[PDB]
């Protein structure tokens, strides 16, 4: 009967990776964080100041604040069963940029590049994503060394 307290169970959460110990690379402090930016939390065990508490590791929020060393990130925690949006002041070394939306934003960049040159053709602009449709009718040619090439089900004996 514990969780309680504050870095418990984080023997593997705030560990370092293997041979990624030591000095922090310098671009970690050279990243720019503007208000309203999507941001993951993966805490740094080698920076003992401004670590998020363990519920928020692995999560994802939006930057609501910038101060001199940290960003306020607003993160969702399910406190059962309901979702509060938690405001967590977290230092910059524990904070990353989300890649999730900058491969949505390279489609807004193409839902206006492809609708641009569609002023000549007209249609279909085809600006929606399609799931993996079932395949087609297609003519598999053999030739290729005609078949059989015939498996039979056999591997036991030892």
């Amino acid at each position: 009967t514990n969780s309680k307290g504050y870095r418990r169970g984080t023997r593997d959460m705030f560990s370092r990776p293997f041979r990624k110990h030591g000095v922090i690379p310098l671009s970690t402090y050279m990243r720019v964080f503007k208000i309203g930016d999507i941001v993951d939390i993966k805490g740094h065990g080698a920076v003992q100041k401004g670590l998020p508490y363990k519920a928020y590791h692995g999560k994802t929020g939006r930057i609501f604040n910038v101060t001199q060393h940290a960003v306020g990130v607003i993160v969702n925690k399910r406190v059962r069963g309901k979702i509060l949006a938690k405001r967590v002041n977290v230092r910059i070394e524990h904070i990353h940029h989300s890649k999730c939306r900058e491969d949505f934003l390279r489609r807004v960049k193409e839902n206006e590049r492809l609708l641009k040159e569609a002023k000549e053709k007209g249609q279909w602009v085809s600006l929606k994503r399609q799931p993996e449709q079932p395949k087609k009718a297609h003519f598999v040619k053999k030739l290729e060394e005609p078949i059989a090439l015939a498996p039979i089900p056999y591997e036991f004996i030892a």
């Binding site: 041979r19 990624k20 110990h21 030591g22 000095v23 922090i24 690379p25 310098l26 671009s27 402090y29 050279m30 990243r31 720019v32 964080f33 503007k34 910038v66 101060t67 001199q68 060393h69 940290a70 960003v71 910059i92």
Partner: protein
């Protein structure tokens, strides 16, 4: 040591493996705030050598520092100083050369002239009104030992004489004693104009006159006498204040394919034929057993 701490071996970065960077200071020199979002900070980098003084202005960007102004000591022959390129005196020129090199291209030489009245006092430029102040640098010394009177502090007073706003204290200027401070501009003024290099070569024709052919050689070749240095450096402090034009050269265009020497390394077909005859002629040599 044998295959198994090599597996667990984590190198240091690349430059701390090679002595170049602190990274405990590089972390703290290149610190910008996060609510100062992408503003550069432009530190002042004077690195010494044996026969060069590289002064630079670089700002912290991710894919490398970007160098915005670079004045060396191997160009001060163009301004009237032929030898003694790594002086305490010859740094204040490259200090002052890199400040006037950057305020003309930033247009900030009409305002922020500087200190041509070179005295050795503490000099902190008050901001010219109708707007904020001047270009700020911060001094980046590396791991030069910052004891009082080093030549690395001989480019901070050179650059602050051009007019740049680099934050100060005179504690490490040559001629400010340690009990107390005891400001004394005159030993700083002596060192600025190269007096105590002149005084040593005015004290060496009294003790050991043969040692001119030793230390302070090539003053004998180029004819620089000891009473000239207080006016060699003085007339250089306006010939530098009149032509800071970056020394840009145009070979046009001889950098790539020069001309003959690509230095290929043993394409793996050769290495597998290198150990074709290395293996075949060994057992033929072992057929000279029988």
């Amino acid at each position: 040591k044998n295959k198994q701490y090599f597996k667990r071996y984590q190198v240091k970065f690349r430059r701390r493996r090679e002595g170049k960077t602190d990274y405990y200071a590089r972390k703290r020199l290149t610190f910008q705030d996060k609510n100062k979002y992408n503003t550069p900070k432009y530190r002042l980098i004077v690195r010494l050598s044996n026969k060069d003084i590289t002064v630079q202005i670089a700002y912290a960007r991710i894919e490398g520092d970007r160098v915005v102004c670079a004045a060396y000591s191997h160009e001060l022959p163009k301004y009237g100083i032929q030898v003694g390129l790594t002086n305490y005196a010859a740094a204040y020129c490259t200090g002052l050369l890199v400040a006037r090199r950057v305020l003309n291209k930033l247009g900030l030489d009409s305002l922020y002239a500087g200190c041509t009245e070179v005295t050795g006092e503490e000099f902190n430029v008050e901001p010219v009104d109708d707007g904020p102040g001047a270009f700020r640098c911060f001094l980046d010394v590396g791991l030069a030992r910052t004891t009082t009177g080093a030549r690395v502090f001989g480019a901070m007073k050179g650059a602050v004489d051009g007019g740049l706003n680099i934050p100060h204290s005179v504690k490490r200027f040559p001629g400010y004693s340690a009990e107390t401070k005891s400001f004394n501009a005159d030993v700083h003024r002596a060192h600025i104009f190269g007096q105590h290099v002149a005084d040593y070569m005015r004290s060496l024709e009294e003790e050991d006159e043969e040692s001119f052919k030793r230390q302070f050689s090539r003053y004998i070749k180029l004819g620089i006498r000891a009473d000239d240095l207080e006016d060699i450096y003085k007339k250089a402090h306006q010939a530098i204040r009149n032509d800071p034009t970056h020394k840009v050269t145009a070979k046009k265009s001889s950098a790539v394919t020069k001309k003959r020497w690509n230095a290929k390394k043993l394409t793996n077909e050769q290495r597998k034929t290198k150990i074709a005859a290395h293996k075949a002629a060994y057992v033929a040599k072992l057929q000279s057993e029988t």
